[PDB]
Scaffold this active site. Sequence first.
Site, PDB file in Angstrom:
ATOM      1  N   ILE A  29      -8.197   6.686   7.065  1.00  0.00           N
ATOM      2  CA  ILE A  29      -8.053   5.242   8.149  1.00  0.00           C
ATOM      3  C   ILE A  29      -6.757   4.819   7.444  1.00  0.00           C
ATOM      4  CG2 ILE A  29     -10.356   4.956   8.598  1.00  0.00           C
ATOM      5  CD1 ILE A  29     -10.350   2.942   6.618  1.00  0.00           C
ATOM      6  N   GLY A  30      -6.075   5.358   6.432  1.00  0.00           N
ATOM      7  CA  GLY A  30      -4.804   4.784   6.223  1.00  0.00           C
ATOM      8  C   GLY A  30      -4.278   5.493   4.661  1.00  0.00           C
ATOM      9  N   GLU A  31      -3.063   4.937   4.240  1.00  0.00           N
ATOM     10  CA  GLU A  31      -2.541   5.438   3.130  1.00  0.00           C
ATOM     11  C   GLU A  31      -1.961   4.528   2.333  1.00  0.00           C
ATOM     12  OE1 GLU A  31      -0.567   8.985   4.317  1.00  0.00           O
ATOM     13  OE2 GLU A  31       0.924   8.040   5.471  1.00  0.00           O
ATOM     14  N   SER A  33       0.278   3.407  -1.850  1.00  0.00           N
ATOM     15  CA  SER A  33       1.147   4.002  -2.640  1.00  0.00           C
ATOM     16  C   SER A  33       0.557   4.871  -3.545  1.00  0.00           C
ATOM     17  CB  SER A  33       2.170   2.983  -3.421  1.00  0.00           C
ATOM     18  OG  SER A  33       1.363   1.705  -3.424  1.00  0.00           O
ATOM     19  N   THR A  34      -0.818   4.800  -3.940  1.00  0.00           N
ATOM     20  CA  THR A  34      -1.466   5.630  -4.981  1.00  0.00           C
ATOM     21  C   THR A  34      -2.302   6.722  -4.257  1.00  0.00           C
ATOM     22  OG1 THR A  34      -3.233   4.093  -5.439  1.00  0.00           O
ATOM     23  CG2 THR A  34      -1.335   3.769  -6.628  1.00  0.00           C
ATOM     24  N   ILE A  36      -5.032   7.795  -0.422  1.00  0.00           N
ATOM     25  CA  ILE A  36      -5.400   7.911   0.878  1.00  0.00           C
ATOM     26  C   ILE A  36      -6.630   7.036   0.806  1.00  0.00           C
ATOM     27  CG2 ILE A  36      -4.040   9.636   1.672  1.00  0.00           C
ATOM     28  CD1 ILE A  36      -6.905  10.858   2.478  1.00  0.00           C
ATOM     29  N   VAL A  37      -7.154   6.653   2.073  1.00  0.00           N
ATOM     30  CA  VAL A  37      -8.220   5.638   2.477  1.00  0.00           C
ATOM     31  C   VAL A  37      -9.111   6.304   3.406  1.00  0.00           C
ATOM     32  CG1 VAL A  37      -9.406   3.403   2.753  1.00  0.00           C
ATOM     33  CG2 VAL A  37      -7.198   3.422   1.397  1.00  0.00           C
ATOM     34  N   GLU A  98     -16.415  -0.908  -0.819  1.00  0.00           N
ATOM     35  CA  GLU A  98     -16.512  -1.745   0.216  1.00  0.00           C
ATOM     36  C   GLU A  98     -15.528  -1.264   1.316  1.00  0.00           C
ATOM     37  OE1 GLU A  98     -16.211  -6.069  -0.287  1.00  0.00           O
ATOM     38  OE2 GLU A  98     -17.197  -6.157   1.622  1.00  0.00           O
ATOM     39  N   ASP A 142       0.937  -6.832  -7.163  1.00  0.00           N
ATOM     40  CA  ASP A 142       1.282  -6.383  -5.784  1.00  0.00           C
ATOM     41  C   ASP A 142       0.693  -7.213  -4.831  1.00  0.00           C
ATOM     42  OD1 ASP A 142       2.950  -4.597  -4.307  1.00  0.00           O
ATOM     43  OD2 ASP A 142       1.275  -3.050  -4.236  1.00  0.00           O
TER      44      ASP A 142
END
Length: 293
Positions: A29-31, A33-34, A36-37, A98, A142
Amino acid sequence: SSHEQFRAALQAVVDPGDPRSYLDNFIKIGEGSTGIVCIATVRSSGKLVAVKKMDLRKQQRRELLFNEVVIMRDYQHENVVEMYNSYLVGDELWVVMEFLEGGALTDIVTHTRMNEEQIAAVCLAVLQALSVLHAQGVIHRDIKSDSILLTHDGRVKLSDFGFCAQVSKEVPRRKSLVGTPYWMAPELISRLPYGPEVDIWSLGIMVIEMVDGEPPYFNEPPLKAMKMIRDNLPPRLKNLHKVSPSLKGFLDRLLVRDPAQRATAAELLKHPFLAKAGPPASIVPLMRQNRTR
Ligand SMILES: CNC(=O)c1cncc2[nH]nc(C(C)C)c12
């Protein structure tokens, strides 16, 4: 070899085992800087969780990966993403956490125009999180729209602690050049030893995101924008005429060049601007799944 050595280190602090044993249907579902999700389904329940996957070989400072397990163990809070377990899976650190189905604040500030009730709600929630963290010496480092996530029902939670650090009596200031160029505090760009104040500056820049739709100097390449932040007076809202005196007064307590004169989270919680804060429900209509429904 130093890779093998680092893996062995991470194993000492993470949960044993493999969440692939209990999760199905990984969908990216996303990326960040460290890493991916992905979302995943808990097989037994049908419940959904998020899985952050961070390759040990693709980090700028791989020792910062320990931040994940420090936050998970020690600084859980209602305005911080719940982190359930951590694992070493092959050459990656996985954090099962979560799923914040309201998404990131980035999508909202990109596509939508927040009103001051909504802005006040986000700032109040973030400042609640920061007051608790800062009181314990934790600096996020951040803060930006991408780091603020929402539940479906519009509750606000901090995420992306990968660059956090701790201050203490024995280590009263940090020195590392860390964060995201456009959101970085000027003392941090200047390489002055710094504290939790840097998060308050970064929040100020996020207010500008929420009002203007982007941070200052966002068209400049990053190395050049940092120079500008370092050298120039505090950035100005493109849309000053569009903000209440209350919000301008609030912002002026955040975007103070001198860290010693910047408001603290604890002080900002009492600002009159935050009396405007709507409940979580006030945020819900901004979310992708709702705003064109
Ligand atoms: C962009 N950031 C993430 O995707 C993320 C990061 N950490 C925890 C998460 N839980 N749920 C999500 C997404 C649904 C926003 C995340």
